[PDB]
Amino acid sequence: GKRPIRLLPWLQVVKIGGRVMDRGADAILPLVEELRKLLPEHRLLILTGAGVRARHVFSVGLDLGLPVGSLAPLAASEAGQNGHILAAMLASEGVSYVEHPTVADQLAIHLSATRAVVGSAFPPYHHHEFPGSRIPPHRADTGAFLLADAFGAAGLTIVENVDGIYTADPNGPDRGQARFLPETSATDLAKSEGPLPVDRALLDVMATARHIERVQVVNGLVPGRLTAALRGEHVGTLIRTGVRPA
Amino acid sequence: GKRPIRLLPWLQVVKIGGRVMDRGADAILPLVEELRKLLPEHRLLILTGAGVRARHVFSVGLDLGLPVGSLAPLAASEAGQNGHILAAMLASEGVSYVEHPTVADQLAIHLSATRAVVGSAFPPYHHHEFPGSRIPPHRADTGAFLLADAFGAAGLTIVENVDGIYTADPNGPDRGQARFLPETSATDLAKSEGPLPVDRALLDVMATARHIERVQVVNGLVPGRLTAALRGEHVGTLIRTGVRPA
Amino acid sequence: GKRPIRLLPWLQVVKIGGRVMDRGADAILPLVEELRKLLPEHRLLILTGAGVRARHVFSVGLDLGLPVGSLAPLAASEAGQNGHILAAMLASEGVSYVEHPTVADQLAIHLSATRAVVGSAFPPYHHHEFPGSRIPPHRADTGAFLLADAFGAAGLTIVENVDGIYTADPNGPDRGQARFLPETSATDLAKSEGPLPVDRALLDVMATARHIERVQVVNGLVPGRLTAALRGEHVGTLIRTGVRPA
Amino acid sequence: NSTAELEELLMQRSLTDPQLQAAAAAAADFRILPDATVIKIGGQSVIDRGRAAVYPLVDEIVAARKNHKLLIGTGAGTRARHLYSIAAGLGLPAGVLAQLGSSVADQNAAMLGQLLAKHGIPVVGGAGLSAVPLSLAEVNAVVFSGMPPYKLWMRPAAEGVIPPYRTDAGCFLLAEQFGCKQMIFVKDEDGLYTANPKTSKDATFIPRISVDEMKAKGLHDSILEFPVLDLLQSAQHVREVQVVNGLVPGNLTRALAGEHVGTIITAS
Amino acid sequence: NSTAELEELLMQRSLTDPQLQAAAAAAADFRILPDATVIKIGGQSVIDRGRAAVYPLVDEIVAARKNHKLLIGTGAGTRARHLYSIAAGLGLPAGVLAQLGSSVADQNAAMLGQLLAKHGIPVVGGAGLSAVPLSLAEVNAVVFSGMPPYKLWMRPAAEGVIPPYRTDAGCFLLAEQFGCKQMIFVKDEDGLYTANPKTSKDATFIPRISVDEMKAKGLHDSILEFPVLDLLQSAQHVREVQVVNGLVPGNLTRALAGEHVGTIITAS
Amino acid sequence: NSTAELEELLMQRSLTDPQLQAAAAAAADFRILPDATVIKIGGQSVIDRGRAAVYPLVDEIVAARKNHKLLIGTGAGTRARHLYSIAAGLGLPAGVLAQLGSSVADQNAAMLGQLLAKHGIPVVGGAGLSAVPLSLAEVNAVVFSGMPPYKLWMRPAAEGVIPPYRTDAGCFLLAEQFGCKQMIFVKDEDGLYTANPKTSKDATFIPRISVDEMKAKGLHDSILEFPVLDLLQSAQHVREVQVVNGLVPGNLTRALAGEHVGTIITAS
Ligand SMILES: Nc1ncnc2c1ncn2[C@@H]1O[C@H](COP(=O)(O)OP(=O)(O)OP(=O)(O)O)[C@@H](O)[C@H]1O
Ligand SMILES: Nc1ncnc2c1ncn2[C@@H]1O[C@H](COP(=O)(O)OP(=O)(O)OP(=O)(O)O)[C@@H](O)[C@H]1O
Ligand SMILES: Nc1ncnc2c1ncn2[C@@H]1O[C@H](COP(=O)(O)OP(=O)(O)OP(=O)(O)O)[C@@H](O)[C@H]1O
Ligand SMILES: Nc1ncnc2c1ncn2[C@@H]1O[C@H](COP(=O)(O)OP(=O)(O)OP(=O)(O)O)[C@@H](O)[C@H]1O
Ligand SMILES: Nc1ncnc2c1ncn2[C@@H]1O[C@H](COP(=O)(O)OP(=O)(O)OP(=O)(O)O)[C@@H](O)[C@H]1O
Ligand SMILES: Nc1ncnc2c1ncn2[C@@H]1O[C@H](COP(=O)(O)OP(=O)(O)OP(=O)(O)O)[C@@H](O)[C@H]1O
Ligand SMILES: [Cl-]
Ligand SMILES: [Cl-]
Ligand SMILES: [Cl-]
Ligand SMILES: [Mg+2]
Ligand SMILES: [Mg+2]
Ligand SMILES: [Mg+2]
Secondary structure, three states: OOOOOOOOOOEEEEEEOHHHHOOOHHHHHHHHHHHHHHOOOOEEEEEEOOOHHHHHHHHHHHHHOOOHHHHHHHHHHHHHHHHHHHHHHOHHHOOOEOOHHHHHHOHHHHHHHOOEEEEEOOOOOHHHOOOOOOOOOOOHHHHHHHHHHHHOOOEEEEEEOOOOEEOOOOOOOOHHHOOEEOEEEHHHHHOOOOOOOOOHHHHHHHHOOOOOOEEEEEEOOOOOHHHHHOOOOOOOEEEEOOOOOO | OOOOOOOOOOEEEEEEOHHHHOOOHHHHHHHHHHHHHHOOOOEEEEEEOOOHHHHHHHHHHHHHOOOHHHHHHHHHHHHHHHHHHHHHHOHHHOOOEOOHHHHHHOHHHHHHHOOEEEEEOOOOOHHHOOOOOOOOOOOHHHHHHHHHHHHOOOEEEEEEOOOOEEOOOOOOOOHHHOOEEOEEEHHHHHOOOOOOOOOHHHHHHHHOOOOOOEEEEEEOOOOOHHHHHOOOOOOOEEEEOOOOOO | OOOOOOOOOOEEEEEEOHHHHOOOHHHHHHHHHHHHHHOOOOEEEEEEOOOHHHHHHHHHHHHHOOOHHHHHHHHHHHHHHHHHHHHHHOHHHOOOEOOHHHHHHOHHHHHHHOOEEEEEOOOOOHHHOOOOOOOOOOOHHHHHHHHHHHHOOOEEEEEEOOOOEEOOOOOOOOHHHOOEEOEEEHHHHHOOOOOOOOOHHHHHHHHOOOOOOEEEEEEOOOOOHHHHHOOOOOOOEEEEOOOOOO | OHHHHHHHHHHHOOOOOHHHHHHHHOOOOOOOOOOEEEEEEOOOOOHHHOHHHHHHHHHHHHHHOOOOEEEEEEOOOHHHHHHHHHHHHOOOOHHHHHHHHHHHHHHHHHHHHHHHHHHOOOEOOOOOOOOOHHHOOOOOEEEEEOOOOOHHHOOOOOOOOOOOOOHHHHHHHHHHHOOOOEEEEEEOOOOEEOOOOOOOOOOOEEOEEEHHHHHHOOOOOOOOOHHHHHHHHHOOOOOEEEEEEOOOOOHHHHHHOOOOOOEEEEOO | OHHHHHHHHHHHOOOOOHHHHHHHHOOOOOOOOOOEEEEEEOOOOOHHHOHHHHHHHHHHHHHHOOOOEEEEEEOOOHHHHHHHHHHHHOOOOHHHHHHHHHHHHHHHHHHHHHHHHHHOOOEOOOOOOOOOHHHOOOOOEEEEEOOOOOHHHOOOOOOOOOOOOOHHHHHHHHHHHOOOOEEEEEEOOOOEEOOOOOOOOOOOEEOEEEHHHHHHOOOOOOOOOHHHHHHHHHOOOOOEEEEEEOOOOOHHHHHHOOOOOOEEEEOO | OHHHHHHHHHHHOOOOOHHHHHHHHOOOOOOOOOOEEEEEEOOOOOHHHOHHHHHHHHHHHHHHOOOOEEEEEEOOOHHHHHHHHHHHHOOOOHHHHHHHHHHHHHHHHHHHHHHHHHHOOOEOOOOOOOOOHHHOOOOOEEEEEOOOOOHHHOOOOOOOOOOOOOHHHHHHHHHHHOOOOEEEEEEOOOOEEOOOOOOOOOOOEEOEEEHHHHHHOOOOOOOOOHHHHHHHHHOOOOOEEEEEEOOOOOHHHHHHOOOOOOEEEEOO
16 A cells, blocks of 8 residues: 555554553552563563553642643653553563653664563653643553554554443443444444543544554453464454555 | 774774765665675664755855854754664664764663664764864764774775765766776875865874774665675775774 | 562672772773673673772862762762773673663663673762761662662672771771671671771661672672672672571 | 542543543633743744844844743754655655654754854743743743654654644644743745645735635645644634744734734634 | 861771761861752642642742742652552562652642743752752742652661652752751641641640650651651751641741741751 | 855765865854853862862852853863773773763862852853853853763874863863853963973963964973864964963953953964
8 A cells, every 4th residue: 555664563562551550469460470471472562551540640630720731741651650560570571661762763672682671652742732622632542553553563452451342331330231342443433422441542543554454452350361362362352443454 | 002992893883875865765775675684794883974954954054154063963963864764774673773872882782682773973073063164074974983993893884875985076077087096095085185975084083093994985876885895895995094903 | 578579580789899990900900801701600780889089079079068968979970980981891792881770770671682781889869868977878889789689689799909898997007906707797787886898878778678688798809709709609708688588 | 529520530430431521621721821922933934044034033033022922933844854755765654754854843943042042042842831931031032843742653644654743733732732822833925825825826815714714715734734723723722823924024023013914813 | 187187088098987987077068059948848738639729839939939949849649659559569679669659749840830830930850959040039949859869779668668768858858958948848737746637636736846856755757757857867957847737828928937837846 | 146156065065075165164154152251160270179279269250240151161180080090001992081081070060060059050061052041140150061072982182092172172162162252261370381380490471372382382282282272273263262370369350351361372
C-alpha cells in the first residue's frame, strides 16, 4: 500500500494496565514470573498504564479547575511510576526502565543490550493535549498503539484486569447484561456508545494505522494468557484495526 | 613519540557528507545497505555532516547579521538531523543515534551493546566558535577528525559525493581544469588556495594530530568504495596527516 | 527476616579511594590492569572517591563560610572526576562512566551491555546534607555502601591506600602505637573515638543495613588483594555490619 | 456533592464512561495565563525571508510588550519541508518526520531570540509557565518554538507521512491550554481569500468567517493547518483566531490594539 | 593562622579526625538566603483537599509575597502512600520507595505552580539559589517540591521500608542549608496536641515545646516526621520551627507577621 | 542583490570557496549584548585565595551592577592543575583533560554564586542569552563558568596534552560572540610586566601594548593564555582587553568607570 517502512519489525509491544499494577504483589508477582519466562522468546517493549492514582490526581486537578492539558502530564507521571515498579522487579534479569526520549530514538540499541525494556505507555502530549473533554483523551492504550504502529512492530498486546471487551461494563451496574466479545473491529466499537476497557482514542488512531492489523486484549490476572497472546493464540478480545494484510 | 594512549584503538570512524544525505533515497538506500554489510566486520562510529540546509540557515542568519558563533549551532542541528535519518534506516540492525555527551564519555559501553552508532560530526564549539570568518570554521570533517584522533581510532574515512580531492572544483567554473589527486599531504593542501571538499580547519587539526596518519576521501555514490577504504584499499584521495608511524 | 528483595544479587561493588587515585599512574596503572583481569570474573560496579582535591575545595569553601550542604556537591565533583579518569583507562575494554541517575534506575541494562561500569561513590545528598559537622558526613564509603545494600549486592569491597583499619592513624602522630585490626564490627568501631580510613557515617548505615553482612577494606597498592577480596579471601580488615545470615 | 459524585465516578468507572465524562465536564474552569496573547511568527511566511521581514517585526514586539503580554512562537519553513521530502522518500513514518521538523522551528526561535536578547526577552522551552518574564514590565514576553511535542507519537494524517499537527497547531494548543485571551497568526498575506492569492488572480478577501463556512466554501486546508480548525471547534478558551500579514509595517501592533486587520476565524 | 592550621589538617588527616572536625567547626558562618522564609504546604493535610483548602492559601501566598520572601515546598500525600503500599508489598527497599514518592510531591508542585503562574511565581527545581525571583518585588517567591534528593541512596529507617526522610525533612533541610530566618509547616491542625487530635477526644493543645520535651512526652513521631526533630537539634541556622493550620483563613499570613499561631518547636 | 549573489554562492559552492568566504564577510554585523562587560575572575589568582580576595570582589560586583551590565566568568585554578597532572601522567589526551578542567571552573562558579544569591545574581550555564537577569536593574549581572565547551573536541597544542583553550579563552570568546563592549581579566598582578613579576626582581610595568609587540618582546605566553592573543587579532567585536589586579580594593570598579588601571592589550 506504499506504506512507510517498518523501523523495528521484530519488536513485540506489551501494554500493562495501570489497574493491573494497582492490585499489588498478588497480580504483579505472577505477571513478573510470566515476563521472566518470555524474555528469551521475544524482544519486548513493556509499557505501563496509570491506574487509580491518576483518578485521584484528576479529582484534585478537576477540583482546582485545571484544564485537560494540565491533567495529562499529571496522569502520565503515574504510568511512569508503575513502569519503575515493574522494571525494579525485573532488574535481576537485566531489565530497566527507559525514558520517552530513549524509547523514541534509542530503543534499537537498548534492545540490543538487553532482552526487554520497560517504559511509560502515556504519550508526551501533556499541555498540548487536545481540548474537548476535561479528561485527557490520549492515554496509555493510545500511546502504546501509536508507538507500536510507528515502529511497525510485530504486535501490540493489551494486558487487562478483565477477559476482554464486553457489551457493557462487567463490573458495573449493567453487568448481568454484559456479553463477551471474542472479536470486534475498531470501527464497530467507535460507533457504539458506552464504556470500554480501552481508550476511545485508540479506535481513532487504529483508523489511520499503517502496520498493526490486530490488537488483542487479554486478562493478565490469568497466568499464561499473555504468553499465548504473544504467539497469536486467541485468549481474549481481538480488535481488528482496519489495516489490510498484503 | 611519548604520545597519549589510544582510548578506542579498535574503532573505525566514518564521516558521511551532508550533501550525500541531501541526495535522498537514491544515495542513502545503497549506502545503508553497504553499512548493513559492514556491521559484522567493523566497530563503527558513523558521523553525519550538515549539507544544504545549513547553507539556507547561513543565508538567513547572515541576512539577520548574526555572528559566526550564532551560525555554528544552527548548522550543527542539520548534521544531527541527518544522523537521526541515517540511524532510523539502520534501527532494525540495532543502530541508534547517540548524542555528543554519550559519544564523548560513553561510546565504549554503547559499542559494547551494538555494532555501530550514529552521531553528529559537528563539534560542540557553538557560540565559542573562533572569530575571523563569518562561516563557522570547525565543521563536520574537522569534528570527525578531532574525535577520531582523540580516541586513537584505527582510521577515519570521509564519504563524499565526488571521487576525492581535485586541483579545482570538479562541479565548478574551472571544472575542465580540475585534475584528480590520488594522494596529498595536509601541509600541501593547506598552502594551496582554492576550494576543497573538506574543511580547511581539518588540515590545521591534522598538523597537531597524535595518532591518525592518513584519511581517505572516497565517493559514497559508488557502492563498494567505503567497504574497500575501510580495508585500506586506495579508491579515493589519501590525505597524509604528518603523524609519523613508529 | 522479612527483608526487602535483592534487586541485583549478582552484583559486586568496588569502591576505589580518592587518595589511591591521587597517587597517579604509579597506583592507577597496576589497579587498571588488575581490573582488566577481573572483568570476565565479576559483574562490577566500580565507584570512585574524592581524595585531596576535595580537601582543597573544603579549604576554600570553609574560608568563604559556606555551609555543609554547599561543600557536599563540591566534594562530589572530585569523586566524579576520578571516575571519569578511571573509566577512560578502561574504555578499550568497553567500560564507561555512568551518571547517578543511570546508576539508580538503569544499572541493570548497562551491566547487560558491558562487564563493568564506573560511577561516583558520593551520594546525591548535596544541599540536603545533614547539619552538625562542617564537613559533609555522607561521603564515598557511605554512598557506596548505601548503593550496594539497596541493590542487595553480593558484596562491597573498599580499596584503600593502607592495609586496613588500625587502632590509630598509621601515617599520623601516634603511628608507632597503631595496631592492625584483621576483623572488627561496625558497632565496635562506632563506639571508639579517633580517626578511621572510612566515613563514620558508614558505621551508621551498616547498623540499618538489610543485606550486606561484611565489608572488607584492602590495600589497593598491593596487586592481587582486590582480586583475592572479591573471592572472599581475608587480605585486609573485615567489617561486620550486624546483618545476620539466615 | 457533585464533587463527591465526580470522585465516585472517577474511582469506580472507566474514563471512557459517558457518565464520568459528563461529570468532569461540569468542573470549574481555571485560566492559567488569561491576559497573555499567543502570536505565531511564520517560518516560511516571515523568518525564512530574512532581515526585511524579521527586523520590523522585532521592532513591533519590543514596542508591543510595553502594554501587551506576549507568547511568541516560531514556525519552521523551507528547511523543514526539505527534511520532510528526504524522510518521506525513504519511507519514514509521520512520527519520525515530526521530530525532524521540531529542530527547524528551534533554529528559528534561536535566531529570533538572539535579536531580542538585548531587550530582555528570553527563549524558553514551550513556555506557558515561564511565569517570571511574563510578570515583569521590563520583559513581558517570551519566545518559544511552535512544534508540538508529539514527536514519534504524532498521529498521522489519513494519507501521507507529513505530520498533520505542526507549528500552527502547536501555537494554538498553547493558547488554548493556558486560557490566553487572544491567538494571532502572523503570515505573509493579508488574510484568508476565496482561493490561494499567490496562484489565483482574482481571489476575494474574507474579513470574518466561521470554521463551518470555511469547510463549506472548500478551504479547510488554506491559510492554516486544517487540523487547527477542528481544534478550534473543540477549544474551551480560545474560540476565535486572527490571521494578519506580518510583512505590513505595524500590522501586528494594530491587531494587538484591537483593530480588525486581517481575517477573524470563529469556531461557530 | 587558624586558617593555616585548618588547611594543614585538611591535607594531612582523614576527615574523620576529631582535630580536623573541630577546626572546621570554627569556620565562619555564611547565610545564603537569610531573609527568606521556607513554608511547607502539606500534601495530605492541604493539597489533597482541593479548592477549599488550596485556593485560600494561594490568596495568602500572593498577599504575603508583598512583604515576605517565600520558598514554598509541597508535600506528597495519599498518592505517595498508595505507591508506598504497592512497593512495600513487593518487598522493594526504602531507596526505591523514595524515588516513587518524589513524583507525587512533583505533581503537587505543578498544580500549585499553575495556580500561581499568573502572579509571576515560578516552579523551580529544589530552588535555593533561584536568586532572580526571590530578589524581585514583583515575584519574591518560588514553589518547589519538598522531597529530598536521596532517592536510591535514602537511608532506611531501623524497621520497615517507608523512607524516613520525606517532605518535612526536605523542606527543613532547605531552610537550614540556606540559613533562612524561618521555617513554617502548614498542616491541617492548629498545632501539636498531647495526642493525635483526630483519634483522641481530649488531647490538649501545646503552644510551645522543645524537642527533648516532645521525646519525653512520648510524641517523637506526631505532627512532624520524627527525623526532623533530630535534624532540628543538629541545625546551625534554623533552631526552631512553627506548625500552623492552613485550613484556617489567614493563619499563614499571621504567622509571617510574627503572631504565635500554632505550635513553636525549639531545638533546645 | 549582494544578498542574492551570496545565496547563490551559498547554494552552489563549498564553504571553503574564497568567493563564498568573501561574500559572507560583507554581511551586516549584529551585536547581541552590546552594553555588557565580560569579566573573568581568576581561579588561581583570586578564587583559590579564599575570603581575603573573594569577599572584596563580591562587594565590587554588587556595587558595580548598579551602573554596569556584567557577565562574570570563573577561572579554574590549582584543582584543575592537579587533575591535569594526574591525567597527563596516565597518557590521557588533551580532550580528556579539557573535560576535567571544566568541573573545577564549575565548582568556582558555584561558590561565587552562593555568595551572590542574596543579591539576586544567578549562576547560569554559559549565559549570553540569559536575557532576563541582564535586563533588570535589580540584577543586571550573571555568573558563569569560564571553560569553553570543546571537551573531547579540544584542539591540542603543538606539544603536550594541556588544553590550550581554557578559562581566559572561554571568557574572551563569550565577549566576542555577543559583541560586548568590554573584556576585563581579573588576576593577581597589576598587569603585564616585561617578565613574570613573581620570579624576576626588576620587571617593568607595561600599561599598554599590542599583540604584535607582546610577541616581539617574547611574552606571547605571559599573563594571558597565549591562544587568547591570536583570538584577539581575529576578533570582530572585542579588539582590546584590560588586565587588572583583583587583589587591589576597588580596582575592578575603577576599570568599569573607565580608569586605565592595569594593562590594555590591543589587537593592533
Ligand atoms: N465494555 C467493557 N468491557 C470490559 N471492561 C469494561 C468495559 N467498560 C468498562 N470496563 C471496565 O474497565 C476496567 C478496566 O479499567 P481501565 O481500562 O481504566 O484500566 P487500565 O487499562 O488498567 O488503566 P490504564 O488505562 O490506566 O492503563 C475493567 O475492569 C472493567 O470494569
Ligand atoms: N578541490 C575540490 N575537489 C573536490 N570537490 C571540490 C573541490 N572544491 C570544491 N569541491 C566541491 O565540494 C563538493 C562537496 O561539498 P561539501 O564538501 O560541502 O559537502 P559535504 O561534505 O557533503 O558537506 P558537509 O561538510 O556538510 O558534510 C563537491 O561535490 C565538489 O563540487
Ligand atoms: N585508624 C586508621 N586506620 C587506617 N588508616 C587511618 C586511620 N585513621 C586515619 N587513617 C588514614 O586514612 C588514610 C586514608 O584517607 P581517606 O580515608 O581520606 O582516603 P580515601 O578513602 O582514598 O578518600 P575518599 O574518602 O575521598 O575516597 C590512610 O592513608 C591513613 O593515613
Ligand atoms: N485561501 C487562502 N488564503 C490565503 N492564503 C492562502 C490560501 N490558500 C493557501 N494560502 C497560502 O497559505 C500560506 C500560509 O501558510 P504557510 O505554511 O506558508 O505559513 P507559515 O505559518 O509560514 O508556515 P510554517 O511556519 O510552517 O513555515 C500563504 O502564504 C498563502 O500562499
Ligand atoms: N500529637 C499530635 N498533634 C497533632 N497532630 C498530630 C499528632 N499526632 C499525629 N498527628 C497528625 O499529624 C498529621 C500531620 O501529618 P501529615 O503526614 O498528615 O502531614 P502532611 O505534611 O500533610 O504530610 P504529607 O505532606 O507527607 O502528605 C495531622 O493531620 C494529625 O492528624
Ligand atoms: N609578564 C608577566 N606579567 C605579569 N604576570 C605574568 C607574566 N608572566 C607570567 N605571569 C603570571 O601570570 C599569572 C596569571 O596567570 P594565571 O594562570 O595564574 O591566571 P588565572 O586567570 O588565575 O588562571 P586560572 O583561572 O586558569 O586559574 C600571574 O599570577 C603572573 O605570575
Ligand atoms: Cl475515552
Ligand atoms: Cl566522619
Ligand atoms: Cl573552510
Ligand atoms: Mg484499560
Ligand atoms: Mg566535504
Ligand atoms: Mg578511606
